[PDB]
Amino acid sequence: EEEKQQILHSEEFLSFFDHSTRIVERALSEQINIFFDYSGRDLEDKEGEIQAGAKLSLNRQFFDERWSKHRVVSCLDWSSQYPELLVASYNNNEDAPHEPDGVALVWNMKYKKTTPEYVFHCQSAVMSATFAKFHPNLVVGGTYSGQIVLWDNRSNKRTPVQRTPLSAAAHTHPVYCVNVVGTQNAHNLISISTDGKICSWSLDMLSHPQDSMELVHKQSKAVAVTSMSFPVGDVNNFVVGSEEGSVYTACRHGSKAGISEMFEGHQGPITGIHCHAAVGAVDFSHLFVTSSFDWTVKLWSTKNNKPLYSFEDNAGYVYDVMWSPTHPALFACVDGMGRLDLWNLNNDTEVPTASISVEGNPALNRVRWTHSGREIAVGDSEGQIVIYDVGEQIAVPRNDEWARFGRTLAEINANRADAEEEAATRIPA
Amino acid sequence: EEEKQQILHSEEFLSFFDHSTRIVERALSLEDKEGEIQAGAKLSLNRQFFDERWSKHRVVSCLDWSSQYPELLVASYNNNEDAPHEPDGVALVWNMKYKKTTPEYVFHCQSAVMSATFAKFHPNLVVGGTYSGQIVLWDNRSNKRTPVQRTPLSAAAHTHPVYCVNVVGTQNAHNLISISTDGKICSWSLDMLSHPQDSMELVHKQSKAVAVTSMSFPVGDVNNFVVGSEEGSVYTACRHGSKAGISEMFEGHQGPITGIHCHAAVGAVDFSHLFVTSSFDWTVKLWSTKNNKPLYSFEDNAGYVYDVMWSPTHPALFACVDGMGRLDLWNLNNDTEVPTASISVEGNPALNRVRWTHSGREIAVGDSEGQIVIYDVGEQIAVPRNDEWARFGRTLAEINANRADAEEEAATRIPA
Amino acid sequence: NEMFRIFSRFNALFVRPHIRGAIREYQTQLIQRVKDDIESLHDKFKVQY
Amino acid sequence: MAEVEETLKRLQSQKGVQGIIVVNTEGIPIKSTMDNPTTTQYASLMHSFILKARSTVRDIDPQNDLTFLRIRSKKNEIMVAPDKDYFLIVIQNPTE
Amino acid sequence: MAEVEETLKRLQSQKGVQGIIVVNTEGIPIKSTMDNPTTTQYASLMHSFILKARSTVRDIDPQNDLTFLRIRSKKNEIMVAPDKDYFLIVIQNPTE
């Protein structure tokens, strides 16, 4: 009776019941049927349709209602320690204003259940959301105000465990970007605010950031950090974009620690940009790509303030874009129309290899592919989740495709040389 | 047995088991420590064994371990040279699982012991030979510390001080081979010590017998082995039949045969023509079967080499021990001239032998100091894939090509 | 987009003395593509800001 | 509590379930999924079988996962799951 | 004439399956080519648990049909179903 209610409300006992329900879901996910036919007699019609678009295959849809309504996919991160886990940063629940402004959700690759394994609920909108690179059971993200919160995936309390300082000296602007950076021994909880507050924080200390720096360049014009990325192994080097459509390299160390380069080719605020995420038999650290709100995607290079190349096929302002993690040619994109634009340049350059805008224009805003890149989570703001699997014939890059990728890059250099020569000669006297 | 087989072979029971197995198959169908697998866990001295009941004034007899009990390794300590009051023969065991410096059995003996081995063919017992040269066998089952079986060396028996002996054959047929200082090739029966299974004071080169300082048989080579002379004349040691014996004294060394083993690596590329060898002249030179000349060499230390052996898994990697107090293991595809990871002995201590793990995740290191340390091994390069074995075979063919090219370049590049 | 791909293919055809004739032939297809693009732009404009 | 209540509701969100009883060793259920008299009867059966399963597990191994043991039967996939203080049992369908 | 051996290997080489040993109708380990003491003790404890499970079944309904009791045991979780004809082990890991 009352003792049963107390035992249900008992913290250790309720936690045991929660772990019990977790293992119950694990077993019910392992609960396969007994009348199966694994010989593949039901895949011939699929094989009859495999030769016409098997490169794209949505896997599941982590859609809910407990926190999904009026909560876009604000950010996405696949857990490094457990690649079978993905996050779902929620927007401010306007429809559930009784509910708070941020409740994290777990899109699960380990299992297919609408119930998330981990949730971080807090009263601020989760702008950034970074998973723990060097830790197994930690969660942290960026408030709409900007004060970074803390949570744990293994724990049983969705509240913000710790909160970063909130002050003029602290993140007054919204935390646009944040990631788990630094070495395993020498880490750095790097975060970026809207005003330009480069916030390298500490996992231990939620009061003093390891390195806090408001950013400004071009005669100290204020830095609206729009596009964010950084170089692998170059903790100093980082990628910066502007709502005024200005790109720049970011320096963490050095006398000019801050906006290092200065690039501008876009015609919109820097919407989607990820580093060249594929590493193979060619080192292409000197190049990247970017997209804005001008229905176009601009490739970039380290020495080229002018954009490298243009993927302008969008019929509307882009939202997100990401180079593939394994295939150098491939690069996926997103927009408010669900513009899944996986484009393998070695495969298909003039058109994308897989250009799939969502029917009904689902709002694909923030996304993260698989650690191997085999699947990419894509989601509408209302919560229409799509994790498209990748056809390995298109997914797996060739061994020479990095040497051939350098070849295609030199071909692009020659074609852009032709274009630039046309630009030089086209000026009349 | 038969009743259980009939229960498993009952038609109703068999059909129910098949249906249930199909249904069940359908229904069921720290952090920084992981960053040194190629960078320190490839060779990590973990089990430094020194039991002062034997670690005082004694040496290491040999290297042995239990294939029957893979968690068990035999710590073969030699005679207490500086302790005459202490006995000259006793055994120790190092456990891969149990964290005890004590043996699982202490096979005692009166005299100094040169060579010994465990027995996967006879898991209850082990055996050894004296430094003087009398063989003996002991069992962990029994309660007498001395070896119950004791094949006494004599004028009739192997009078010369034996150093090479192996339990030739598995439990199906075990004729435990032996060799005196003169090389009394003596197969010993799995249960008879009064008479060995065979005996052969073999000789070659117009019967000019020598002291075979090393020996190695191929996998399943009941009719072949190696005979590496201390004179440096590596005799081809056929092991069975009327053609058994020292056939061809290969000359691929300049000193007594310090460390040698068969190409124990297993993979796609067959190394049946290979030969691993080290000389006492501070020169380790891998040889070949058909080509009696050495295939390739490695002679870094000005001092001689404690041991040398082909790695049991990686054709590229190898297990060698040098007298310079430095670890000797090189991945041939990766690092051929320089060692892959030339670690050093603690205080450059004097090494005796080595014993790789059967899984290859560990390897012993000899130590005359007393702390018998074993290096825990990773799978960065010791794990040979078949393609990695194919890559190593390509490297071996390229090494043959490079040797022929070196011969041609020496022919076209001799100044006179 | 297909017309742009065709124009990109034909952009190097200045040396061949058939660019003008091809343009005179395909002006109708270009006008149709322009009409479709104008319809799309009008639909976007009719999308209320 | 209410989190455990929602966990039970979600495990029972699958329609067509005969009955899942969050249980207790006192012969009564913490939260059953049937009529109260039959709930008490099946919960007494649950407490009895729970003691029996604890004893049988200790006979097998007294150092095992002391949380649960399902019984997927052709009549009811009984997912018994007793805790140290509270208990549970889900006599469900085999499909889930 | 090798379907029984094929099924024994399939349930033996199964993922997470620590062993599929054909024990007798009484449950004593008949097919035991290993340490017979521990195998027979595990089989007898499994028979005791099967008796407890049959008791639980009769508490629900005596003549019910069973597919496989999925006992969650840390040493060896058993998704098995005993009978009065023989006892072949069905104990596999849910993660495998």
DSSP code per residue over chain E: --HHHHHHHHHHSSTT-----EE-TT---SS--S-HHHHHHHHHHHHHHHHHHHHHHHHH-TT---SBEEE--TTT-EEE---SS-EE-----TT-
Task: Locate the chain E residue with the closest alpha carbon to B10.
Answer: E4
Cβ within 8 Å of residue E85, ≥6 positions away: B12, B13, B16, E25
Technique behind the model: cryo-EM
Q: Using a threshold of 3 CB pairs under 8 A, tell whether chains B and C touch.
A: no
- Are B257 and B281 in contact by the 8 Å Cβ rule? The answer is no
Name residue B72's beta-bridge partners. B95
Minimal C-alpha gap between D92 and chain A (Å): 11
Could you give the CA distance from residue A279 to residue A277 in angstroms, rounded to a whole number? 7
- Interrupted after residues, chain B (C–N over 2.5 Å): 29
Count contacts between A and C (CB, < 8 Å).
Answer: 7
Task: Locate the chain E residue with the closest alpha carbon to A20.
Answer: E72
Q: Using a threshold of 3 CB pairs under 8 A, tell whether chains D and C touch.
A: no
Cβ within 8 Å of residue A247, ≥6 positions away: A227, A239, A240, A241, A261, A262, A263, A264, A265, A266, A270, A290, A300
The answer to whether the Cβ–Cβ distance between B31 and A184 falls below 8 Å is: yes
Task: Locate the chain A residue with the closest alpha carbon to D26.
Answer: A4
Long-range contacts: C43-47, Cβ < 8 Å, 24+? C44/A316
Gyration radius from chain A CA atoms = 23
Instruction: Tell which residue, A382, E94, B144, has the closest CA to residue D68.
Output: E94
Task: Locate the chain C residue with the closest alpha carbon to A316.
Answer: C44
Domain boundaries of chain D, sorted by first residue: 1-96
Could you give the CA distance from residue B217 to residue B263 in angstroms, rounded to a whole number? 9
Amino acid identity, residue D52?
A: K
Write the class of the CATH domain D1-96: alpha beta
The answer to whether the Cβ–Cβ distance between D63 and E42 falls below 8 Å is: no
- Are D77 and D92 in contact by the 8 Å Cβ rule? The answer is yes
Cβ within 8 Å of residue E71, ≥6 positions away: D53, D57, D69, D70, D71, E49, E77, E78, E79, E80
**Tokens for E8?**
């024994």
**Tokens for A368?**
């993260």
Which residues in chain B are closer than 8 Å to A32, comparing Cβ atoms? 26-29
Could you give the CA distance from residue B358 to residue B207 in angstroms, rounded to a whole number? 38
Could you give the CA distance from residue B58 to residue B352 in angstroms, rounded to a whole number? 12
Name residue B76's beta-bridge partners. B62
Alpha carbon D45 to its chain centroid, in Å, reads 10
Residue recorded with tokens 């056929």: B238
Q: Report the DSSP pairing between strands A139-141 and A149-151.
A: antiparallel
Could you give the CA distance from residue C10 to residue C2 in angstroms, rounded to a whole number? 12
The answer to whether the Cβ–Cβ distance between A18 and D30 falls below 8 Å is: no
For residue B24, give the nearest of E22, E32, E68 by CB distance. E68
Task: Locate the chain D residue with the closest alpha carbon to E58.
Answer: D45
Could you give the CA distance from residue B106 to residue B89 in angstroms, rounded to a whole number? 10
For residue A33, give the nearest of B27, B31, B35 by CB distance. B27
Q: SS3 sequence, chain A?
A: CHHHHHHHHCHHHHHHHHHHHHHHHHHHHHCCCCCCCCCCCCCHHHHHHHCCCCCEEECCCCCCCCCCCCCCECCCCECCCCCCEEEECECCCCCCCCCCCEECEEEECCCCCCCCCCCCEECCCCCCEEECCCCCCCEEECCCCCCCEEECCCCCCCCCCCECCCCCCCCCCCEEEEEEEECCCCEEEEEEECCCCEEEECCCCCCCCCEEECCEECCCEECCEEEEECCCCCCCEEEEEECCCCEEEEECCCCCCCECCCECCCCCCECCCCECCCCCCCCCCCEEEEEECCCCEEEEECCCCCCCCEECCCCCCEEEEEECCCCCCCEEEEECCCCEEECCCCCCCCCCCEEECCCCCCCCCCCCECCCCCEEEEECCCCCEEEEEECHHHHCCCCCCCHHHHHHHHHHHHHHHHHHHHHHHHCCC
Query: Phi then psi for B294, rounded to 5 degrees?
Result: -70, 140
- Are A133 and A182 in contact by the 8 Å Cβ rule? The answer is no
Cβ within 8 Å of residue B56, ≥6 positions away: B80, B83, B86, B370
Residue A151 vs residues A127, A137, A203, A278, C42: alpha-carbon distances, Å? 15, 9, 11, 31, 48
Which residues in chain B are closer than 8 Å to E67, comparing Cβ atoms? 23
Query: Phi then psi for D37, rounded to 5 degrees?
Result: -65, -50
CA dihedral B66, B159, B262, B190 (to 10 degrees): -40
Name residue A323's beta-bridge partners. A331
Q: In the 8-state DSSP scheme, what is residue B37? A: T
Q: Is C14 helix (H, G, I), strand (E, B) or coil?
A: coil
Minimal C-alpha gap between E56 and chain B (Å): 22
- Are A380 and A395 in contact by the 8 Å Cβ rule? The answer is no
The answer to whether the Cβ–Cβ distance between E86 and B4 falls below 8 Å is: no
Which residues in chain A are closer than 8 Å to B32, comparing Cβ atoms? 184-185
- Are E24 and E17 in contact by the 8 Å Cβ rule? The answer is no
Task: Locate the chain A residue with the closest alpha carbon to C3.
Answer: A350
**Tokens for A384?**
């229409």
- Are D18 and E60 in contact by the 8 Å Cβ rule? The answer is no
Reported in sequence order, the residue ranges of B304-360 that DSSP labels E, i.e. its strands, are 307-310, 318-321, 327-328
Residue recorded with tokens 């008796």: E51
Could you give the CA distance from residue A410 to residue D89 in angstroms, rounded to a whole number? 66
Could you give the CA distance from residue A318 to residue A290 in angstroms, rounded to a whole number? 10
Could you give the CA distance from residue B210 to residue B275 in angstroms, rounded to a whole number? 20
Helix then strand then coil, in percent of chain C rounded to 5, is: 75, 0, 25
Which residues in chain A are closer than 8 Å to E96, comparing Cβ atoms? none
**Tokens for A322?**
């990401």
Could you give the CA distance from residue A318 to residue A335 in angstroms, rounded to a whole number? 4
The answer to whether the Cβ–Cβ distance between A34 and B23 falls below 8 Å is: yes
Q: Would you tell me which residues 64-83 of chain E have a C-beta closer than 8 angstroms to some C-beta of chain B?
A: 67-68, 79, 81
Could you give the CA distance from residue B18 to residue B41 in angstroms, rounded to a whole number? 45
Angle formed at CA C9 by CA C8 and CA C13, multiple of 5 degrees: 105
Could you give the CA distance from residue A26 to residue E77 in angstroms, rounded to a whole number? 14
Which residues in chain A are closer than 8 Å to E94, comparing Cβ atoms? 26-27, 30
Q: Is B26 exposed, middle or buried (0-12, 13-18, 19+ CB in 10 A)?
A: middle
Could you give the CA distance from residue A389 to residue A387 in angstroms, rounded to a whole number? 6
Q: Which residues of B touch E (CB under 8 A)?
A: 3-4, 7-10, 12-18, 20-25, 27-29
Amino acid identity, residue B256?
A: P
Name residue A102's beta-bridge partners. A122
Task: Locate the chain A residue with the closest alpha carbon to E70.
Answer: A27
Q: Is B254 helix (H, G, I), strand (E, B) or coil?
A: coil
Alpha carbon A213 to its chain centroid, in Å, reads 23
For residue E73, give the nearest of D52, D64, D94 by CB distance. D64
For residue A350, give the nearest of C5, C40, C44 by CB distance. C5
Strand arrangement of the beta sheet that strand B164-166 belongs to:
B164-166, B175-179, B188-189
Which helix (H) or strand (E) is B387 found in, with range?
helix B386-411
Long-range contacts: A415-421, Cβ < 8 Å, 24+? A416/A308, A416/A309
Task: Locate the chain A residue with the closest alpha carbon to C37.
Answer: A315
Could you give the CA distance from residue A258 to residue A216 in angstroms, rounded to a whole number? 8
- Are E62 and D65 in contact by the 8 Å Cβ rule? The answer is no
For residue A313, give the nearest of C1, C8, C40 by CB distance. C1
Which residues in chain E are closer than 8 Å to B27, comparing Cβ atoms? 68, 79
- Are D46 and D80 in contact by the 8 Å Cβ rule? The answer is yes
The answer to whether the Cβ–Cβ distance between D88 and A20 falls below 8 Å is: yes
- Are B333 and B395 in contact by the 8 Å Cβ rule? The answer is yes
Q: Is B89 helix (H, G, I), strand (E, B) or coil?
A: strand
- Are A320 and A334 in contact by the 8 Å Cβ rule? The answer is yes
Long-range contacts: A155-158, Cβ < 8 Å, 24+? A156/A14, A156/A15, A156/A18, A158/A103, A158/A104, A158/A119, A158/A120, A158/A121, A158/A122
Q: SS3 sequence, chain D?
A: CHHHHHHHHHHCCCCCCCEEEEECCCCCCCECCCCHHHHHHHHHHHHHHHHHHHHHHHHHCCCCCCCCEEEECCCCEEEECCCCCCEEEEEECCCC
Could you give the CA distance from residue A202 to residue A178 in angstroms, rounded to a whole number? 12
Instruction: Tell which residue, C3, C2, C9, has the closest CA to residue C26.
Output: C3
For residue E88, give the nearest of B15, B17, B28 by CB distance. B17
- Are A425 and A419 in contact by the 8 Å Cβ rule? The answer is no
Q: Is B135 helix (H, G, I), strand (E, B) or coil?
A: strand
For residue E79, give the nearest of B7, B22, B24 by CB distance. B24
Count of residues for chain E? 96
Instruction: Tell which residue, B264, B203, B265, B262, has the closest CA to residue B235.
Output: B203
Could you give the CA distance from residue A411 to residue A306 in angstroms, rounded to a whole number? 18
Q: Would you tell me which residues 56-85 of chain E have a C-beta closer than 8 angstroms to some C-beta of chain D?
A: 56-57, 59-61, 64-75, 77, 79, 81
The answer to whether the Cβ–Cβ distance between E60 and D77 falls below 8 Å is: no
**Tokens for B373?**
């340390």
Angle formed at CA A77 by CA A201 and CA A232, multiple of 5 degrees: 65
Query: Phi then psi for B253, rounded to 5 degrees?
Result: -150, 165
Long-range contacts: B342-348, Cβ < 8 Å, 24+? B342/B300, B343/B43, B343/B375, B346/B45, B346/B371, B346/B373, B348/B324
Task: Locate the chain E residue with the closest alpha carbon to B9.
Answer: E4
Q: In the 8-state DSSP scheme, what is residue B9? A: T
For residue D73, give the nearest of E65, E71, E75 by CB distance. E65
**Positive/negative CA dihedral, B376, B378, B381, B387:** positive
Mutate to test the interface with B, among E77, E90, E91 (most CBs of B within 10 A): E90
Could you give the CA distance from residue A224 to residue A199 in angstroms, rounded to a whole number? 14
Query: Phi then psi for B95, rounded to 5 degrees?
Result: -95, 125
Could you give the CA distance from residue B162 to residue B113 in angstroms, rounded to a whole number? 9
Could you give the CA distance from residue A253 to residue A237 in angstroms, rounded to a whole number? 8
**Tokens for A278?**
């594929």
**Positive/negative CA dihedral, A214, A220, A224, A228:** negative
Q: In the 8-state DSSP scheme, what is residue B273? A: T
Q: Is B258 helix (H, G, I), strand (E, B) or coil?
A: strand
CA dihedral A49, A50, A53, A55 (to 10 degrees): 160
**Tokens for A247?**
């790109």
Which residues in chain D are closer than 8 Å to A19, comparing Cβ atoms? 67
The chains found to touch C (3+ Cβ pairs under 8 angstroms) are A
- Are B148 and B140 in contact by the 8 Å Cβ rule? The answer is no
The answer to whether the Cβ–Cβ distance between A27 and E67 falls below 8 Å is: no
Instruction: Tell which residue, B60, B64, B94, has the closest CA to residue B79.
Output: B60
**Positive/negative CA dihedral, B358, B360, B361, B367:** positive
The answer to whether the Cβ–Cβ distance between A17 and D83 falls below 8 Å is: yes
- Are A294 and A317 in contact by the 8 Å Cβ rule? The answer is yes
The chains found to touch A (3+ Cβ pairs under 8 angstroms) are B, C, D, E
Mutate to test the interface with E, among B21, B26, B29 (most CBs of E within 10 A): B21
The answer to whether the Cβ–Cβ distance between E95 and A23 falls below 8 Å is: no
The answer to whether the Cβ–Cβ distance between E79 and B27 falls below 8 Å is: yes
Resolution of the experimental model in angstroms, please?
6.2
Could you give the CA distance from residue B227 to residue B221 in angstroms, rounded to a whole number? 13
- Are E87 and E24 in contact by the 8 Å Cβ rule? The answer is yes
Cβ within 8 Å of residue D90, ≥6 positions away: A24, D11, D17, D20, D21, D70, D77, D78, D79, D80, D81
Name residue A301's beta-bridge partners. A287
Q: Using a threshold of 3 CB pairs under 8 A, tell whether chains E and C touch.
A: no
Count contacts between A and B (CB, < 8 Å).
Answer: 21
Could you give the CA distance from residue E31 to residue E23 in angstroms, rounded to a whole number? 6
Amino acid identity, residue B88?
A: D
Residue B376 vs residues B44, B56, B75, B154, B241: alpha-carbon distances, Å? 5, 25, 16, 41, 41
**Positive/negative CA dihedral, A253, A258, A264, A270:** positive
Could you give the CA distance from residue A62 to residue A350 in angstroms, rounded to a whole number? 33
Name residue B214's beta-bridge partners. B228
Mutate to test the interface with E, among A16, A23, A30 (most CBs of E within 10 A): A30
Minimal C-alpha gap between B22 and chain A (Å): 8
Query: Phi then psi for A45, rounded to 5 degrees?
Result: -65, -35
**Positive/negative CA dihedral, D5, D10, D12, D15:** positive
**What is the number of helices (H) and of strands (E) in chain C?**
2, 0
How many CA atoms lie less than 13 Å away from B53 in the CB half-sphere? 11
Cβ neighbours, 10 Å, residue B253: 29
